[PDB]
Design a protein around this ligand. Structure first.
Ligand code: HEM
Ligand SMILES: Clc1ccc([C@@H](Cn2ccnc2)OCc2ccsc2Cl)c(Cl)c1
Ligand SMILES: [K+]
Length: 455
């Protein structure tokens, strides 16, 4: 590839025939930081087979996301990724099925019917696996990350993929599945990057075949979410075999449980590390369908996602795309190239939009009167895209409302019915594990111990 004057700069790396794959996969966040300062806001690099063009100017996010014409497509790239990782082969129309099923059953009425079960399942799991002793004041030490993740995963799994007659048995396997899910989740970025030791490729194979069987469409379950059954109806109706339906189910299990848990971890952890904040939500909590009446919690969860939701927004260009920068410069993107945004660096951590951006400020999105603050600026200019945990366009997360009910209910239940303390409130928060930069909600570099007991 030879660059044309009208294209953005093309950086081939100091050592050519190697590129930036090594520095990119190691710490994507730091790699893009260096590139922004070196080439400015728009630059192109080769990763894997593809050529990627990054746009770091938040002001230009406007036209790109409102793809007025038909030029950018998220699904053409995503289907390649899920094929490698889950072996699911996209069929004509499944992209629209998912969104229809989601708008219909993960929003409005579908969502409240579902939220009622999620609450039921989250209460049952907390109580049953709580841990007990003959002494009623006994503290119980656990690991906060594994704790939150196991809770959201079990309740999420049972609310979506169905429960059975024996509700204790459900929990037991749900926990057994969790352990194996966590093993798959941990290898996932390196799987996407093919940076696995030969033994690890086998583990990913075993985990695949394992979930395929547990979630198999032949396997007695009652009351599965309308979201899932609606989607399998489409698949069976288009002649999708059952084996491929099993691969579909595993992909949706990972999609629906992959971030909700880790996001709960950071929120509760930020709340424990800021007495100011945990009291505001506890008090809001004390005083059914009240999830829409928690402005304080709402802002605690936006701020958490601002600090720990670091996805990449990828679009394949299938017709030559022309981007005009606020500056006054035009840039041409070739069809076949991957358009990429990293709103974490461009938006979340921009000090002009969010002063002291690396600081958890539970009230960051609250107006002095407690109303919702939706007015943010970069040097006088209004930024409609001030937080971007879900993305935008026709590919914005169709489960973001469920995820939010999921996380909000967990927090409320925890801060209400439990005494919480960090084993070591003096040590610094774990930093993001850099190997997952760009894949959704970040995960801690190391777990933190915490103790809990009832009131
Ligand atoms: C904190 C939790 C979550 C976060 C941070 C998150 C974030 C995201 C992001 C950034 C995207 C890509 C947006 C884009 O490319 O424009 C996405 C897409 C998607 N999300 Fe989520 N998500 C979460 C939870 C969930 C849940 C619970 C589900 C299902 C129940 C789900 C299902 C999906 C699906 C199927 C897509 C595919 C995009 C498409 O429809 O083309 N996500 N999510
Ligand atoms: Cl089926 C599916 C739907 C969305 C995704 C999101 C992550 N996610 C998962 C669940 N909710 C959000 O992918 C973002 C992303 C990061 C690097 S490449 C790439 Cl795509 C995936 Cl991985 C599979
Ligand atoms: K898809």
């Amino acid at each position: 590839r030879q660059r044309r004057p009208w294209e953005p700069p093309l950086d081939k790396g100091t050592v050519p025939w190697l590129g930036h794959a090594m520095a990119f996969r190691k710490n994507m966040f730091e790699f893009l930081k260096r590139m922004r300062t070196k080439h400015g806001d728009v630059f192109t690099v080769q990763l894997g087979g593809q050529y990627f063009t990054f746009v770091m100017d938040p002001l230009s996010f406007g036209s790109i996301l409102k793809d007025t014409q038909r030029k950018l497509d998220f699904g053409q790239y995503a289907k390649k990724l899920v094929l490698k990782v889950f072996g699911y082969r996209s069929v004509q129309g499944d992209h629209e099925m998912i969104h229809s099923a989601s708008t219909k059953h993960l929003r409005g009425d579908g969502l409240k019917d579902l939220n009622e079960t999620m609450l039921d399942s989250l209460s049952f799991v907390m109580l049953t696996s709580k841990g007990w002793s003959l002494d009623a004041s006994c503290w119980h030490e656990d690991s906060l990350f594994r704790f939150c993740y196991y809770i959201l995963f079990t309740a999420g799994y049972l609310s979506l993929f169905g429960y059975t007659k024996d509700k204790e048995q459900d929990l037991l396997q749900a926990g057994e599945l969790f352990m194996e899910f966590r093993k798959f989740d941990l290898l996932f970025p390196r799987f996407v990057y093919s940076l696995l030791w030969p033994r690890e490729w086998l583990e990913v194979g075993r985990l695949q075949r394992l979930f395929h069987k547990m979630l198999s469409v032949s396997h007695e379950k009652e009351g599965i979410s309308n979201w899932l059954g609606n989607m399998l109806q489409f698949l069976r109706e288009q002649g999708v075999p059952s084996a491929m339906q099993d691969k579909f189910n595993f992909m949706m299990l990972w999609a629906s449980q992959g971030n909700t848990g880790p996001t709960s971890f950071w929120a509760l952890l930020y709340l424990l590390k800021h007495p100011e904040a945990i009291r505001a939500v506890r008090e809001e909590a004390t005083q059914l369908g009240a999830l829409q009446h928690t402005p304080v919690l709402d802002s605690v969860v936006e701020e958490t996602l601002r600090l720990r939701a670091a996805p990449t927004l990828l679009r394949l260009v299938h017709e030559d795309y022309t981007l005009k920068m606020s500056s006054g410069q035009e840039y041409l993107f070739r069809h076949g190239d991957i358009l990429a945004l990293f709103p974490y660096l461009s938006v979340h951590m921009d000090p002009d939009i969010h002063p002291e951006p690396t600081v958890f400020k539970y009230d960051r999105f609250l107006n002095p009167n407690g109303s919702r603050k939706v007015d943010f600026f970069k040097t006088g200019k209004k930024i409609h895209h001030y937080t971007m945990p879900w993305g935008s366009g026709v590919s914005i997360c169709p489960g973001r409302f469920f995820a939010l009910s999921e996380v909000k209910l967990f927090i409320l239940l925890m801060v209400t019915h439990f005494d919480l303390e960090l084993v070591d409130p003096d040590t610094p928060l774990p930093h993001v594990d850099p190997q997952r930069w760009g894949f959704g909600t970040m995960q801690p570099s190391h777990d933190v111990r915490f103790r809990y007991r009832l009131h």
